[model samples]
Target: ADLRALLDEDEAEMSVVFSDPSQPDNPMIYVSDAFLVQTGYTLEEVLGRNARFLQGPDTNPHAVEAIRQGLKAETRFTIDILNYRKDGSAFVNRLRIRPIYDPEGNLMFFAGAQNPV
Candidate 1:
């Protein structure tokens, strides 16, 4: 199905991803369908782009720092973030993120839910 059609059909932008936070060279991230719509970025375009791409130069550095601190602590934190769109327009975004654990009790993935400001 056409991507635009998919986004048009759903009024929300949702994204799913797996996260590897420990290794600097392997701090890999993945994103799912809904995320693309929220940021107005196509799946292809979002590849290799860190979530930080959502932040522009004007974004609050403090918020970014807060997230980084949380990452280091291995905790769940949700914050209202200032994020940018593919066109460079900025808006407030509600970002919810969590780590997923496998049945064996091992962390396997991270998932995120996003909504417009």
Candidate 2:
């Protein structure tokens, strides 16, 4: 059995992880196979890139601003945003992002889950 095969068979919700919060852009470190299938992006295209690539002209600035504010405040937030797939198709994404901290209470990573709505 192949790992990709196993992942393709999974019906779980898509998730992603961004690390190094201190960096200019909290670039994506990991994305689940589900995320790839959902967004039509390969791991190579998304890794080390900002998830903002999903945004397009139709994406709500209010939702984007809300997420920015939450990031600055180091708080968890959820928003429904219009996101574009790699093929430039639009989808309503119900997104939730939460911060992760180390034992010393330093921010480690941000975990996000996205579901189509």
Candidate 3:
């Protein structure tokens, strides 16, 4: 929601990706485009895709497990994960996700703020 807040969190760059909570797998929604530009991932192909799309073969299992639990915990969680670009190069991705709620206090969506480190 607040793009400015996202940029300041990483202290340098930002890309906040949105996803739906109602979806069984929380598919991609929208956002600023750092993940797209840095990862060489195309927009059309990424739409409706899961987070695993960016995960590489060598991605850390511990990081993946942590992120999985963080999602269920519903807190502002941050971690670094190894992500692969569409061109087949890997990079360290500083991932941060915050649970967003509606005015009624009901969960709405998650704001996944990411940066390439």
Candidate 4:
């Protein structure tokens, strides 16, 4: 929650929480209130669902490749891509993804913000 407050004024429109990557389908996650309001999806719909929910056949391949690279390198990065809302309307998503590390330098969690432009 402290982290949330620290970034409360961030320009991003939405924020999401996901479980550790090893268990991508874990049910527990912390999505901020703005996420639901912005995407029109309830927490139940996105939790345990892969981030690909934002992707579709029309999604830009380059963005997908960049995401793959970030995942492979375990790095923090931001990208802007076209994504669809639950109702299938396309919007620009400004995504910021980062890996959280523990004291031992092990990956702990992965978090990101999704802002629709």
lDDT agreement with native, every candidate: 0.63, 0.74, 0.76, 0.71
TM-scores for all predictions = 0.72, 0.82, 0.82, 0.78
| Backbone clashes (count) for model 1 | 4
Q: List the residue pairs that clash in candidate 1.
A: 13-34, 14-34, 14-35, 16-32
lDDT of 4 by residue, 7-116 (tens): 33553434665445777443335667777677779978976766767787688898888987886687889899888877878888888877767779888666777877
Regarding TM-score, does 3 or 4 come out ahead? 3
Cand. 2 TM to true fold? 0.82
Over the stretch 4-56, how does candidate 1's per-residue lDDT look in tens digits? 22222443444544456544532436666666675688767766545667789
By lDDT, is 1 or 4 better? 4
Write down the RMSD of all candidates, one decimal each. 5.8, 5.1, 3.1, 3.2
> Which digits, one per residue and each the tens of the lDDT, describe model 3 over residues 6-101?
333445445667778689798877756776787777788787867767788999888898987888887888898998888998889888888877
Candidate 2 C-alpha lDDT tens digits along 3-113: 222222443444554545766688877777778888888889998887888889899888898888888777788889998898999988888776777679777777777
